[PDB]
């Protein structure tokens, strides 16, 4: 018969990342999670209490409830033709902050500073991001760099 337990199909997921087994380091227990923090869920295999389901491994949500040895994380789940909001009480060994919000909050301090510096100096701030723009025209010199002529190679076996 079929088997669809709570930890089915998780041979390699809750595995403990070769030659980094054993107890976990103490900066996992010293992070400070505030209500609204954006977290990533990566289930520690060695802490069997408070683990998430295998759907939520690698899923990113926000913290809604902060208690003694765990936090409450809000995850959206794709089910049917809608999304539901899921609440997960997971211990802090299976969690870490996102660095993609560290892209944001550091760029907020940069964007707010460049607006103030342009306000005192010559507004037209121009503080949006821009995509990778195409390359400009340039002059490449052949001095010391005379082009070597490369031809296609004949076929050889070499076994």
């Amino acid at each position: 018969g079929k088997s669809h337990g709570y930890r089915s199909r998780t041979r390699y997921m809750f595995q403990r990342d070769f030659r980094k087994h054993g107890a976990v380091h103490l900066s996992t227990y010293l992070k400070v999670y505030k209500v609204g923090d954006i977290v990533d869920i990566k289930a520690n295999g060695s802490i069997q209490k408070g683990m998430p389901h295998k759907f939520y491994q690698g899923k990113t949500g926000v913290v809604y409830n902060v208690t003694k040895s765990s936090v409450g994380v809000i995850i959206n789940k794709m089910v049917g033709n809608r999304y539901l909001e899921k609440r997960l009480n997971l211990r802090v060994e299976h969690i870490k902050h996102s660095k993609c919000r560290q892209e944001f909050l550091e760029r907020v301090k940069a964007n707010a500073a460049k607006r103030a510096e342009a306000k005192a100096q010559g507004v037209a701030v121009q503080l949006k991001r821009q995509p990778a723009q195409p390359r400009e025209s340039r002059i490449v010199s052949t001095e010391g760099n005379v082009p070597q002529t490369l031809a296609p190679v004949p076929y050889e076996t070499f076994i």
């Binding site: 052949t142 005379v146 082009p147 002529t149």
Partner: protein, 51 residues
């Protein structure tokens, strides 16, 4: 009521773009370029006709 084409129908070509009247004056699309007598470097020709 009807879309008159520009690039024929010279009146509608003149309604849009009032520069076109003088673009046929100085002719501006059969203008000659100024002749400049610069020659390429030798190394450009050596890498062009190289084997």
């Amino acid at each position: 009521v009807l879309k008159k084409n520009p690039l024929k129908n010279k009146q509608v070509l003149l309604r849009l773009n009032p520069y076109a009247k003088v673009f046929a004056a100085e002719k501006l699309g059969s203008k000659k370029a100024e002749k400049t007598g610069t020659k390429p470097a030798a190394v450009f020709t050596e890498t062009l006709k190289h084997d």
